[PDB]
Amino acid sequence: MNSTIQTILGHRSIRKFTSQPIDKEQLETILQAGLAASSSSMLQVVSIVRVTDIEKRSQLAKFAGNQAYVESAAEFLVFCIDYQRHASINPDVQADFTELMLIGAVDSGIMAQNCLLAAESMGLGGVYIGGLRNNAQQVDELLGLPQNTAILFGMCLGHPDQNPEVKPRLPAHVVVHENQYQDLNLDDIQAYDQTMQNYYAQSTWSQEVTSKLAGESRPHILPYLNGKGLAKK
Amino acid sequence: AMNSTIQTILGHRSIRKFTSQPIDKEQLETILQAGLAASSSSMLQVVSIVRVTDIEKRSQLAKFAGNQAYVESAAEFLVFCIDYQRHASINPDVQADFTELMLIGAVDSGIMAQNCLLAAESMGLGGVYIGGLRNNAQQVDELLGLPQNTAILFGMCLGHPDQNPEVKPRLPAHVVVHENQYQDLNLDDIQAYDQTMQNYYASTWSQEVTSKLAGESRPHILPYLNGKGLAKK
Numbered sequence: 001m002n003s004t005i006q007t008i009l010g011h012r013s014i015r016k017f018t019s020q021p022i023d024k025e026q027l028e029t030i031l032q033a034g035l036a037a038s039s040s041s042m043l044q045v046v047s048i049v050r051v052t053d054i055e056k057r058s059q060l061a062k063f064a065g066n067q068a069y070v071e072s073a074a075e076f077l078v079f080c081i082d083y084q085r086h087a088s089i090n091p092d093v094q095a096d097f098t099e100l101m102l103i104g105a106v107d108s109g110i111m112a113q114n115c116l117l118a119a120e121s122m123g124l125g126g127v128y129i130g131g132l133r134n135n136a137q138q139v140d141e142l143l144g145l146p147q148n149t150a151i152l153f154g155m156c157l158g159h160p161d162q163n164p165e166v167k168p169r170l171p172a173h174v175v176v177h178e179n180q181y182q183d184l185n186l187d188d189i190q191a192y193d194q195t196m197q198n199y200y201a202q203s204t205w206s207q208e209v210t211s212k213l214a215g216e217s218r219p220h221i222l223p224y225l226n227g228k229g230l231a232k233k
Numbered sequence: 234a235m236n237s238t239i240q241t242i243l244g245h246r247s248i249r250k251f252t253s254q255p256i257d258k259e260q261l262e263t264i265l266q267a268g269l270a271a272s273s274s275s276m277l278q279v280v281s282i283v284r285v286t287d288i289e290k291r292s293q294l295a296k297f298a299g300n301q302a303y304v305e306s307a308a309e310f311l312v313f314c315i316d317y318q319r320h321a322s323i324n325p326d327v328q329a330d331f332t333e334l335m336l337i338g339a340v341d342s343g344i345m346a347q348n349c350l351l352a353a354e355s356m357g358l359g360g361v362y363i364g365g366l367r368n369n370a371q372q373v374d375e376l377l378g379l380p381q382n383t384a385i386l387f388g389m390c391l392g393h394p395d396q397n398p399e400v401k402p403r404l405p406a407h408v409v410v411h412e413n414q415y416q417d418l419n420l421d422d423i424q425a426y427d428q429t430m431q432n433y434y435a436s437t438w439s440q441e442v443t444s445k446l447a448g449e450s451r452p453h454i455l456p457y458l459n460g461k462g463l464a465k466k
């Protein structure tokens with residue numbers, strides 16, 4: 001074994017926190033972990049907004065779809081794509097290529113996952129909040145983001161006050177392909193649907209996820225990004 | 234606040250030179266298991282991994298990544314992909330062409346990849362992300378036989394390290410982390426960091442990153458994604 005692996009494998013989203021704050025030294029370490037993430041071309045295109053102002057916390061909770069743990073978490077971090085630093089160094093920077101939004105999205109996930117694992121390694125718990133993107137522009141303006149930047153997701157951190165079971169995922173032989181993409185075996189989806197309702201014990205996982213994707217998935221996001229100068233071509 | 238997870242995170246270096254020693258089957262199983270334990274937006278599970286063991290494809294991928302020889306010499310090479318094809322194979326009604334979903338695919342891929350890499354690093358392995366595959370995304374896509382609704386994002390080399398670089402410094406936290414609202418860049422923080430990086434090595438950092446972003450960044454990538462059915466609106 002080792003403690004990093006058991007930390008990774010014991011992951012659960014935590015959505016209920018005690019009122020205990022996170023020590024100043026733990027938070028410094030969590031952010032230090034984030035900053036040690038790999039970075040495409042060393043561009044360093046991620047910014048983090050730490051929200052301590054409780055009026056802003058309450059507004060973010062509402063913008064995220066009334067997720068109360070946005071308010072009650074000890075800390076709330078907002079991960080943002082940031083090409084404003086670069087444009088402030090050299091205004092010829094071309095930040096509107098879709099490639100650069102891919103980079104900002106991937107690098108944000110890498111950094112955020114270092115932050116979360118570092119926190120979980122210390123007995124803390126957390127959850128990602130993609131719900132900020134429901135009202136992306138309102139969140140953007142609330143945190144004062146300039147052009148060439150955009151919100152991607154938030155992250156709640158705190159001392160956990162709940163003990164969920166680990167949720168199973170699709171098996172590695174479904175998700176991992178050897179040398180070339182393998183067509184899906186629908187029997188593996190049926191076996192996994194069974195695993196999920198065992199976990200949850202009417203819609204099965206397969207019906208829920210494809211029900212969600214049959215509709216429109218935040219169709220305001222490309223205009224939002226375009227409005228900040230991003231993903232225009 | 235210091236355990237071996239934190240120690241692994243902060244001790245991270247990109248490794249680009251590997252010994253010939255293979256990775257044990259048990260270790261690779263654990264690395265992939267660690268990736269599968271990552272958070273997933275809405276439990277969509279939008280990520281696939283192609284593990285490339287065929288040496289001719291390894292050679293081709295090395296070329297397509299920009300002649301990066303460690304693609305070929307790494308013990309294992311993993312290609313991370315956005316995957317909405319599992320969902321469309323479940324229900325052809327799924328709408329996978331929203332930009333929102335490429336965004337989810339990219340973030341979730343970085344989260345999963347970083348679980349894999351940290352797991353590897355915790356075992357004394359090393360590795361490096363290979364975004365260079367996107368230089369030739371379409372040819373890489375055809376080589377791995379990806380269907381519609383999937384797209385490569387980046388690769389990942391893993392192996393037993395045969396170099397030990399020093400840990401490379403990042404922008405300071407007080408530049409990257411903002412309290413409550415976005416903060417303007419102080420160009421003297423860039424000047425300081427430019428000197429910190431010049432020491433690390435011997436164009437400054439800021440000249441190199443901006444002059445790179447002054448050009449076009451992989452302008453073929455939006456057509457690449459659109460040709461796979463993604464990011465069209």
Ligand SMILES: Cc1cc2nc3c(=O)[nH]c(=O)nc-3n(C[C@H](O)[C@H](O)[C@H](O)COP(=O)(O)O)c2cc1C
Pocket residue numbers: 011012013014015067127128129130131132153166167271272273274275276340341344
């Ligand atoms: C990018 C991203 C955004 C997320 N956004 C939310 C959110 O807005 N609200 C929420 O409750 N959970 C959110 N989650 C948490 C997922 O629902 C959770 O990871 C998933 O259900 C699997 O559960 P687990 O993390 O406990 O293993 C998000 C996860 C990711 C990766």
Ligand SMILES: Cc1cc2nc3c(=O)[nH]c(=O)nc-3n(C[C@H](O)[C@H](O)[C@H](O)COP(=O)(O)O)c2cc1C
Pocket residue numbers: 037038039040041042106107110245246247249298301361362363364365366387400401
């Ligand atoms: C998304 C992504 C793609 C990357 N692609 C490459 C690559 O193609 N070639 C390479 O040598 N390094 C690649 N890297 C590694 C970066 O060059 C590296 O993280 C940074 O320059 C080096 O800092 P480090 O030693 O702290 O990781 C990539 C990193 C990320 C996050």
Ligand SMILES: [Cl-]
Pocket residue numbers: 011012013014120124125126127
């Ligand atoms: Cl957690």
Ligand SMILES: [Cl-]
Pocket residue numbers: 040041363364365
């Ligand atoms: Cl890259």
